[PDB]
Scaffold this motif. Structure first.
Motif: not given
Lengths: 203, 148, 58, 99, 194
Positions: C1, C5, C20-23, C26, C29-30, C33-34
């Motif tokens: 990650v 960034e 957990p899928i929340e891992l 996102f 989308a990141l 963005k990049m």
RNA sequence: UUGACAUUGUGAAGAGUUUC
RNA sequence: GUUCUUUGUAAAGUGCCUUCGAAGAGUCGAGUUGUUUGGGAAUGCAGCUCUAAGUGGGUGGUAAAUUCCAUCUAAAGCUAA
RNA sequence: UUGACCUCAAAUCAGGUAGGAGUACCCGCUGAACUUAAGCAUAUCAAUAAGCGGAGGAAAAGAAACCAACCGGGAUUGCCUUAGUAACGGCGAGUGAAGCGGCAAAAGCUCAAAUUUGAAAUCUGGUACCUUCGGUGCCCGAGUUGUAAUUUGGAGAGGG
């Protein structure tokens, strides 16, 4: 790390995606037994910032509670006394349900020491938490410094005595003027200040 | 001690000195302050007036030491001087040289105007004085220093 | 990650089967963005084998 | 601040060589470091919004703003957070109007 | 019950107090214990003098804004002003605080003076074993006493500015009274036109 | 026992922008 | 107090310029209910309902609005006498 | 077909641990009434006794989301005093703290949130050997859905 994005997503508990996730997860946990070991956390970030470390010795158990006031266990409202102790229905239990839950798993498994717990999910009927445990017999723990304080016999059942977060919160421990009663021990304060102290050469 | 007490002298006199008729029973007229409107109203009034009531304003979390203003008069004012030096300044009586007097370090917070002091000009370091105090000092030729 | 960034990333791969899928959710989308080339994939187990590990997730 | 040397008044107190200390960074808990602004502004668009936000913005292109303040007051129990959330919603709906 | 003219009492003995009564017959035994504790600590101490340095302090609110007190710690500011660091200082018989931000120059100066004095005044053994090997003191409550300042001279000449300090007080009071009013009032006429 | 709030999702049809 | 190795090409600390500088959410907070408190338009605790922000937040012992100030930095944690 | 993974199970599996006792003191929870009020229901007795859980040699608390408003102090606990006070209350009976100051005793600190990324550097276990409250090698295993090194806001990191 990504734990920050994870936090900031968690703190929006009304988004559609969390609504969905919540529904799935609450249904799942509700189908499960009231207490079940979890393979791993549902909020790893949260566990990690409350001191979880994925390693041999740490454990998560997930827990349910039954979510309401605490109706007085009295037969038919027969309290036998004055009107002020005549209430049954609208009575609240001073320990949190989180505290209860922690206590119940610590009773289920007593070889382990609690560390903390955290909310995951709820409904009207139940509340769900994920609870953090350690086997202080484990060599990894005893050889790492950084946690081995818990190996001490003093920290036995520290949920049972009111020494976790929720424990120290409901037990009235925080600095300041709004905690004068019950900051350094309620019973201690009351005892201190209902005691008569008498010297030899009387003052 | 015991032996001086009358109960050694009552021994034999049935009804140790509380009587036979109006005998010494437990709690007649109730306990403590019971009856201050009903059957002890006449002791409440007459020797304890004002007991019953509210009056005035409240002040939650009154911290004294907001109101620490201990008090002194010109009448004394001088014992502050060490006596050995006192007569020296007193005989000097000079505007070119007057003794400095810090009441605050002495433990006082306000100065009042009782008494008559000599005509010596005297220097004061004092917060919170009275008009008359300042006046008599000025008539003595002294002055005052307001301070914090 | 952090590499993303920093735009160090040339390519990204994200297994779908997480919990957990929340891992993970996102990350698309990141990468958008990049401007990073990213892709969803199958078999984080295969990724583990690609790592000499059981499971990789990315 | 600038004391007078007087035991009472507006600027009562000891006239003193008032220094200044070094600043503690604990005063800066409200920081907004780039990392975090990025994370937050992203998570917003991933999460969309919540129904009370939705109702409020509809209220803002209805009903004036004052009503939306009363509503957010009902929801959060303040007027400060209400004002702030309102300003935030204006910022967002500005984006929706003019991209 | 009520009886003859007497001041009214409030004696709080309705509450099973007899079970909870502490007496101090050990007023003497604990004194022995404490003397023995101090002596024994000192005996094992390697002459570090049983109390760590503590700083000079401006004594809070008005009742005691006059006094000067021994506080807890010396402000890292004043430390590095003396020319060292907190950690080494703590190894030395020194006590350090991160609160109590220095705001008063003379106290800054005083504490740095204390610290320099103490630094010059003590004698540290090497990190190795052999040294001058002793001589003990147990003070540092006392050998660096904590006095008040001078704060003035014995006597001075008179400088009568002819003013009424009393009237000054009343004026300050009235100012503190009427700041808000006159402020709002000037604001009112200012915004009036236009 | 009765009303509101939540559990509690997706939509339709119809009655006084609403909300029955 | 002696007596051996030699850590080591590795650890710490120290200065000035610069970029910055992450900081704990079903929590805080609010409403209500009950209890408790010296705590008084609500001291704390718990239940339920609502549910945040990052020049922000908590408090500043009279509720609300407005503008300033001051002090700390929670919701994770250990610690002898 | 073969091999993984996730999840959940079993085993008189290898090794470990909890129970109960005691309970003066300690942390909690639950929780009365006689009584007092000259009656009595609020209030008091009492945030007590009884009942339940759980520890230690001391516990608990503790390094400030503090006290304050001074020229400011500076973890906690206890003594003195604050004070029978501010406050509470059928403002009736009654109850009733906290700051400041003096003393005792003294001690500070760690995690999260950061790319090791020119190299999981982390750890349990098994096994041979050994100078065995442990250590070297080897192997298996856990682990990146994050173990190690760094930093904890008093700051601090990056580079120069």
């Amino acid at each position: 790390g990504a734990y920050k994005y994870l936090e900031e997503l968690q703190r929006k508990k009304q988004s559609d995606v969390l609504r969905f996730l919540q529904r799935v997860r609450v249904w799942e946990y509700r189908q499960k037994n009231v207490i079940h070991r979890a393979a791993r956390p549902t909020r790893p970030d949260k566990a990690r910032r409350l001191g979880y470390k994925a390693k041999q010795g740490f454990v998560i158990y997930r827990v349910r509670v039954r979510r309401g006031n605490r109706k007085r266990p009295v037969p038919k409202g027969a309290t036998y006394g004055k009107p002020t102790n005549q209430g049954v229905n609208e009575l609240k239990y001073q320990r949190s349900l989180r505290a209860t839950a922690e206590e119940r798993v610590g009773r289920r498994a007593a070889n382990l020491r609690v560390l903390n717990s955290y909310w995951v999910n709820q409904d009207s009927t139940y509340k769900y938490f994920e609870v953090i445990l350690v086997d202080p017999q484990h060599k990894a723990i005893r050889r790492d410094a950084r946690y081995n304080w818990i190996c001490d016999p003093v920290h036995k059942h520290r949920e049972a005595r009111g020494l976790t977060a929720t424990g120290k919160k409901s037990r009235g421990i925080n600095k300041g003027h709004k905690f004068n009663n019950t900051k350094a021990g309620r019973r201690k304060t009351w005892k201190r200040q209902n005691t008569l102290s008498l010297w030899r050469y009387r003052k | 001690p015991s032996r001086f007490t009358k109960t050694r002298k009552h021994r034999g006199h049935v009804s140790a000195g509380k009587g036979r008729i109006g005998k010494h029973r437990k709690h007649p007229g109730g306990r403590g302050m019971a009856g201050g409107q009903h059957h002890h109203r006449i002791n409440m009034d007459k020797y304890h007036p004002g007991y019953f009531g509210k009056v005035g304003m409240r002040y939650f979390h009154k911290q004294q030491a907001h109101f620490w203003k201990p008090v002194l008069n010109l009448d004394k004012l001088w014992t502050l001087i060490p006596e050995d030096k006192r007569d020296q300044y007193l005989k000097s009586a000079s505007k070119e040289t007057a003794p400095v007097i810090d009441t605050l370090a002495a433990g006082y917070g306000k100065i009042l105007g009782k008494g008559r002091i000599p005509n010596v000009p005297v220097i004061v370091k004092a917060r919170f004085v009275s008009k008359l105090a300042e006046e008599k000092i000025r008539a003595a030729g002294g002055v005052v220093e307001l301070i914090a | 990650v952090a590499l993303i960034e920093n735009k160090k990333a040339k390519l990204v791969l994200i297994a779908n089967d997480v919990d957990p899928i929340e891992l993970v959710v996102f990350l698309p989308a990141l990468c958008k963005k990049m401007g990073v080339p990213y892709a969803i994939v199958k078999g984080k187990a295969r990724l583990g084998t690609l790592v000499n590990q059981k499971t990789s997730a990315v | 601040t600038v004391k007078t040397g007087i035991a009472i008044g507006l600027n009562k107190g000891k006239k003193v060589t008032s220094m200044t200390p070094a600043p503690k960074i604990s005063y800066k808990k409200g920081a907004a470091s780039n990392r975090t602004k990025f994370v937050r502004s992203l998570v917003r668009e991933i999460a969309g919004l919540s129904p009370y936000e939705r109702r409020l913005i509809d209220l803002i292109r209805n009903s004036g703003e004052k009503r939306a303040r009363k509503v957010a007051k009902k929801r959060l129990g303040s007027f400060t957070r209400a004002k702030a959330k309102v300003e935030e919603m204006n910022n967002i709906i500005a984006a929706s109007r003019r991209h | 019950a009520i009886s003859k003219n007497l001041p009214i009492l409030k004696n709080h003995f309705r509450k099973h107090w007899q079970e909870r009564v502490k007496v101090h017959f050990d007023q003497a035994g604990k004194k022995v214990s404490r003397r023995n504790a101090r002596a024994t600590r000192a005996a094992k101490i390697a002459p570090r003098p049983l109390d760590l340095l503590r700083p000079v302090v401006r004594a809070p609110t008005v009742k005691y804004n006059r006094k000067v007190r021994a506080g807890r710690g010396f402000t890292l500011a004043e430390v590095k002003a003396a020319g060292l660091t907190a950690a080494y200082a703590r190894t030395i018989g020194i006590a350090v605080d991160h609160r109590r931000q220095n705001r008063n120059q003379e106290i800054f100066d005083a504490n740095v003076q204390r610290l320099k004095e103490y630094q010059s005044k003590i004698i540290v053994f090497p990190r190795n074993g052999k040294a001058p090997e002793a001589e003990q003191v147990l003070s540092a409550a006392a050998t660096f006493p904590i006095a008040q300042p001078a704060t003035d001279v014995e006597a001075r000449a008179v400088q009568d500015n002819g003013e009424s300090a009393f009237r000054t007080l009343r004026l300050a009071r009235s100012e503190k009274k009427f700041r808000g009013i006159r402020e709002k009032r000037a604001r009112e006429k200012a915004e009036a036109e236009a």
